[PDB]
Amino acid sequence: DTTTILMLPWLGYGHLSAFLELAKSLSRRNFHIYFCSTSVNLDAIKPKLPSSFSDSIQFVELHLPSSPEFPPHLHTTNGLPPTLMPALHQAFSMAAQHFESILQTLAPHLLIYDSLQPWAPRVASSLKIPAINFNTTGVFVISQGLHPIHYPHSKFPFSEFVLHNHWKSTERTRKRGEAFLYCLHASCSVILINSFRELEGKYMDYLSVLLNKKVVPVGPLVYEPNEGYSSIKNWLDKKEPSSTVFVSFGSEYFPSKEEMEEIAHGLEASEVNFIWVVRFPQWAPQAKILKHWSTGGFVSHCGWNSVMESMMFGVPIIGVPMHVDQPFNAGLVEEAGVGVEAKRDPDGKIQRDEVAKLIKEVVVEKTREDVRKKAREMSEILRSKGEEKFDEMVAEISLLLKIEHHHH
């Protein structure tokens, strides 16, 4: 009979997008995919799965405990009030017993889990089902955290990047224990990750050594669009080449009113064209917008998907980080030469004028072209990479399932 994989993303839009792209490729390689998340997430990613995959990728609903005031359409981090974040983690924790009922019933041959379920590799070991880890974000930020663990004294070897730590609850108590999580099977001996070596080759090689694991890259996993655009195309089509920037901040961080005020001033002082329709706690075609001639700028919060999309498309990155991984991703962009970072002032807050200085210097004015060279060059290699992108991954999955075949 055919082979089956259960895919469990973390409950976030970026994770869902990454996991669906990996789910699609595994379908094309003659695997049966069990795509498992909550009903609200499955609905939000359902549009991106074409009707040709209906027999090879099934959506399997995970039930979080619901109540009239915390109902299922809130069982996701997308658009969720931050003060409800504790409940979502609690409700997710409690979904472990149902997830086990899913594994027992489906009896998959493999579990590919996101890096945020502590109970997913623990439940899969109980049923003797191999489970591989898939990280949807970059390796560069992970090696910065594991470097003091072994080398508190040595400087970070390959990078000269530094951070303000102005960013500086009990999650860390759980995070450090993963670093020391053991491994006596081939299922955890290799991890898949959403990056490509042209961007983070040294950091994958370094991370492979710290973790004692094989770091198999399967990135970048960017989703290409197939109205909204019709109205927006009018702006892009009319304006001359390279005169606009896009402002993206994501659906999980809602910038503070002062922060939005300081950022807004960067846009006005920069005297640049702008396309921004931000959200508030409870959409736009970002990919299509990044893929127009008029587009030569991206003022992004530097989430991994936004960083990957620009490098794939070729649009220079104006970075304004303000959350967990953004500053590192933003440091990596500048090191790579494919963008510039706006160094937020020695004060805690964002510098209103610092943002404005960079947008004009990069988009309206070709003051910095060293970056533009790097943006197009990077995008050429990404598109050049084709079906070999999943070659190394398929080989390890094949080998892993064969090893476990004897352990019975």
Instruction: Provide the token pair at 254.
Output: 């809602």
Are residues 257 and 391 located together in one domain of the fold? no
Instruction: Provide the token pair at 144.
Output: 């910065």
Report d(CA 110, CA 187) in Å as an integer. 9
Breaks, C-N > 2.5 A, in the chain lie after 168, 226, 282
Phi, psi dihedral angles at 372 (to 5 degrees): -60, -40
Report d(CA 205, CA 210) in Å as an integer. 9
Phi, psi dihedral angles at 21 (to 5 degrees): -65, -45
- Give strand pairing partners of 131: 111
Report d(CA 157, CA 147) in Å as an integer. 9
Contact 325, 157 (CB under 8 A): no
What Cα–Cα distance (Å) separates residue 123 from each residue in 130, 181, 190? 10, 15, 18
Report d(CA 299, CA 294) in Å as an integer. 15
Are residues 213 and 236 located together in one domain of the fold? no
- C-beta neighbour count of 118 within 10 angstroms: 14
CATH number at residue 303: 3.40.50.2000
Closest CA to 353 of 260, 286, 263, 279: 263
Contact 83, 96 (CB under 8 A): no
Are residues 50 and 134 located together in one domain of the fold? yes
Quickly tell me which residue has 């962009």 as its tokens.
333
Are residues 296 and 171 located together in one domain of the fold? no
HEC string for 19-75: HHHHHHHHHHCCEEEEEEECHHHHHHHHHHCCHHHCCCEEEEECCCCCECCECHHHC
Are residues 178 and 325 located together in one domain of the fold? no
Contact 255, 263 (CB under 8 A): yes
HEC string for the chain: CCEEEEEECCCCHHHHHHHHHHHHHHHHCCEEEEEEECHHHHHHHHHHCCHHHCCCEEEEECCCCCECCECHHHCCCCCCCHHHHHHHHHHHHCCHHHHHHHHHHHCCCEEEECCCCCHHHHHHHHCCCCEEEEECCCCHHHHHHHHHHHCCCCCCCCCCCCCCCCCCCCHHHHHHHHHCCCCCCCCCCEEEECCCHHHHHHHHHHHHHHHCCEEEECCCCCCCCCCCHHHHHHHHHHCCCCCEEEEECCCCCCCCHHHHHHHHHHHHHHCCEEECCCCCCCCCCHHHHHCCCCEEEEEECCCHHHHHHHHHHCCCEEECCCCCCHHHHHHHHHHHCCEEECCCCCCCCCCHHHHHHHHHHHHHCCCCCHHHHHHHHHHHHHHHCCHHHHHHHHHHHHHHHHHHHHCC
Are residues 71 and 198 located together in one domain of the fold? yes
> Is 114 a catalytic site residue?
yes
Are residues 371 and 393 located together in one domain of the fold? no
- How are strands ordered across the β-sheet holding 3-8? 57-61, 31-37, 3-8, 110-113, 131-135, 190-193, 214-217
Are residues 61 and 200 located together in one domain of the fold? yes
> Is 205 a catalytic site residue?
no
Quickly tell me which residue has 């991703």 as its tokens.
329
Report d(CA 57, CA 24) in Å as an integer. 8
- C-beta neighbour count of 19 within 10 angstroms: 26
Report CA torsion sign: 130, 133, 287, 260: positive
Are residues 59 and 138 located together in one domain of the fold? yes
Contact 193, 139 (CB under 8 A): yes
Are residues 379 and 392 located together in one domain of the fold? no
Q: What's the number of CA atoms in the CB half-sphere (13 Å) around residue 362?
A: 32
Closest CA to 363 of 234, 247, 189: 247
- For residue 248, what are the domain limits? 229-383
Catalytic residue, candidates 75, 114, 147, 325: 114
Question: What's the number of domains the chain is made of?
Answer: 2
Report d(CA 107, CA 334) in Å as an integer. 45
Query: At residue 53, what is the residue type?
Result: F
Catalytic residue, candidates 15, 32, 75, 301: 15
Q: Name the structure determination technique.
A: X-ray
Are residues 389 and 376 located together in one domain of the fold? no
Are residues 210 and 260 located together in one domain of the fold? no
Q: What is the resolution of this structure in A?
A: 3.0
